[PDB]
């Protein structure tokens, strides 16, 4: 989607505590319970994650029912990476 | 009739432009740099906003309509 | 613990702040970071098209918030960083730039962080 | 990016995209027939 | 009146959640400040599974949507006290034969082949038309009694729906069961109830 990463970071936090959230298919309401991000953005952000795995896919009345997988949690541990020093070799030489 | 339209519009583009942050005045050894084009005094910017030079009108593109300095 | 090891205070410095999501990429964004207290490190290319842009950033690095690092060509530098998208097991990618980086966060202290910064300030 | 607004009037449910609709049940009154069969309203329990 | 609207919204929660849902039924009793919310399924084991994360995902969401108090609630596993009476699994089992196939008519028979086994006295399974992707001509199969409609209120009627999406045609369904009365004894078949005593040399005699 064409939605910045700043609004994505919010969603992630509530998905670690839960991992199922819902949001009625009615656009422009501005806020969900919890997530303070519009109903255009959040619903379609879930869709983007959903298509890339992360989620077991059931439709069912007017919400689109997303249930995170174990793999899902790990995938979301790249947005909020874990406690944020995550390891391997990203610089290119000292100064000197 | 149905829906007819005249051509619709079809569109061009909003127009994506280079920033133009090439400008600066850079000195020789002891490379002090002074900054050409005025900065937004707003703390939130962390400014390098280098206000656009339009005919009797200058604004920072970060901050809305605001900071309209004609001179 | 924590002084790094022999010849590993090189590439293991920026481990921390890639994960923090805080790496300010591109020369234009990098310049505004130095025009602010935010620059804890400054990383540049060498080989460039319009290397004139790099000179502007080096002028800012001469003034307060003083750091420099190098390694050449824009696209290769982004392999280390993140805009190389995998899409095959045997490390073959589109290989897009990232290039020139200015570093926020780190939030630990010690190790490679001190070592790199000290060199530029006092040679 | 958006323009001009003003256009209050009959809201409309999620369940129905139809001008008329119900506050009581959160339905329509064709949707309601399903709910009537289900009972769903308190003190009511089918087969009349 | 307003309280009646509130009650309807609580029922709506069950309808949305237990739409498709490949488990089996949910009766709910509401204790003070907490919802018991009891799943009446064979595979009530998978949906809970204890501790994990799974169980918390189910609860929390419902609470923020609709109920009162920043608190927890409760979730209970249950067996089934006759799978007949009410379920969701009863419909889903038939669907899980209309996958890989086997004759549609044979699959219909197999559902009935159960049900009567757990008592029932009458059962009617009725499966959507369009065999061989022809025009619709819904097919029955029934043994015994069975009253959905006609006789009294308290027949204890299972009813559902489902769909099976083929290349050429939908195959609906509506499993239906008329079973016993709530297991404890309270049997009352078809509303007038006859009964005699045994034999009349009296001074003792009475019965029902």
Swiss-Prot record, chain D:
Zn(2+) binds at residues 13, 16, 31, 34. Its cofactor is Zn(2+). It holds the Pfam family Ribosomal_S14. GO terms for molecular function: structural constituent of ribosome; zinc ion binding. It comes from the Eukaryota. GO terms for biological process: cytoplasmic translation. One of its GO terms (cellular component) is cytosolic small ribosomal subunit. Binds 1 zinc ion per subunit. The keyword Ribonucleoprotein applies. The keyword Chloroplast does not apply. Keywords: Metal-binding, Ribonucleoprotein, Ribosomal protein, Zinc. Belongs to the universal ribosomal protein uS14 family. This is Small ribosomal subunit protein uS14. It comes from Triticum aestivum. The lineage of its organism: Eukaryota, Viridiplantae, Streptophyta, Embryophyta, Tracheophyta.
């Amino acid at each position: 989607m064409i939605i910045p990463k700043k609004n994505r970071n919010e969603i992630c936090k509530y998905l670690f505590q839960e991992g199922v959230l819902y949001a009625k298919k009615d656009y422009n309401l501005a806020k969900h319970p919890q997530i303070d991000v519009p109903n255009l953005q959040v619903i379609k952000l879930m869709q983007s994650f959903k298509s890339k795995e992360y989620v077991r896919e059931t439709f069912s009345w007017q919400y689109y029912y997303w249930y995170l997988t174990n793999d899902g949690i790990e995938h979301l541990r790249n947005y909020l990476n874990l406690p944020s020093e995550i390891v391997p070799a990203t610089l290119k030489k000292s100064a000197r | 009739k149905t829906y007819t339209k005249p051509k619709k519009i079809k569109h061009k583009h909003k127009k994506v432009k280079l920033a133009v942050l090439q400008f600066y005045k850079v000195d020789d050894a002891t490379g002090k740099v002074t900054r050409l084009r005025k900065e937004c005094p707003n703390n939130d910017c962390g400014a390098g906003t280098f206000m656009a030079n339009h005919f009797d009108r200058h604004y920072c593109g970060k901050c809305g309509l605001t900071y309209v300095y004609n001179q | 613990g924590e002084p790094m090891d022999l010849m590993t205070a090189l590439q293991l410095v920026m481990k921390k702040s890639s994960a923090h999501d805080g790496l300010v990429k591109g020369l234009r964004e990098a310049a505004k970071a130095i025009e602010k207290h935010a620059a804890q490190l400054c990383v540049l290319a060498e080989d460039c098209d319009q290397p004139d842009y790099v000179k502007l950033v080096k002028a800012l690095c001469a003034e307060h918030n003083v750091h420099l690092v190098t390694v050449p060509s824009a696209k290769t530098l982004g392999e280390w960083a993140g805009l190389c998208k995998i899409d095959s097991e045997g490390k073959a990618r589109k290989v897009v730039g990232c290039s020139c980086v200015v570093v926020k966060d780190y939030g630990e202290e010690s190790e490679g962080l001190n070592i790199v910064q000290d060199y530029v300030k006092s040679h | 990016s958006h323009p001009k607004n003003y256009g209050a009037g009959s809201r409309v449910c999620r369940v129905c995209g139809n001008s008329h609709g119900l506050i009581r049940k959160y339905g329509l009154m064709c949707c309601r027939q399903c709910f009537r069969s289900d009972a769903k309203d308190i003190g009511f329990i089918k087969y009349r | 009146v307003s309280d009646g609207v509130f009650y309807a919204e609580l029922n709506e929660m069950l309808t949305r959640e237990l739409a498709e849902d490949g488990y089996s039924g949910v009766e709910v009793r509401v204790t003070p400040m907490r919802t018991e919310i009891i799943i009446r399924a064979t595979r009530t084991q998978n949906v809970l599974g204890e501790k994990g994360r799974r169980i918390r995902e189910l609860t929390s969401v419902v609470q923020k949507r609709f109920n009162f108090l920043e608190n927890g609630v409760e979730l209970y596993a249950e067996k089934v006290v006759n799978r007949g009476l009410c379920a969701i699994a009863q419909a889903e089992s038939l669907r899980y034969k209309l996958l890989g196939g086997l004759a549609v008519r044979r699959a219909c028979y197999g559902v009935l082949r159960f049900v009567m086994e757990s008592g029932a006295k009458g059962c009617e399974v009725i499966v959507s038309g369009k065999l061989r992707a022809q025009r619709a001509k819904s097919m029955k199969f029934k043994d015994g009694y069975m009253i959905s409609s006609g006789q009294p209120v308290n027949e204890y009627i299972d009813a559902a729906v489902r769909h099976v999406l083929l290349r050429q045609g939908v195959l609906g369904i509506k499993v239906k069961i008329m079973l016993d009365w709530d297991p404890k004894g309270k049997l009352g078949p078809t509303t007038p109830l006859p009964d005699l005593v045994t034999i009349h040399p009296p001074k003792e005699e009475n019965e029902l």
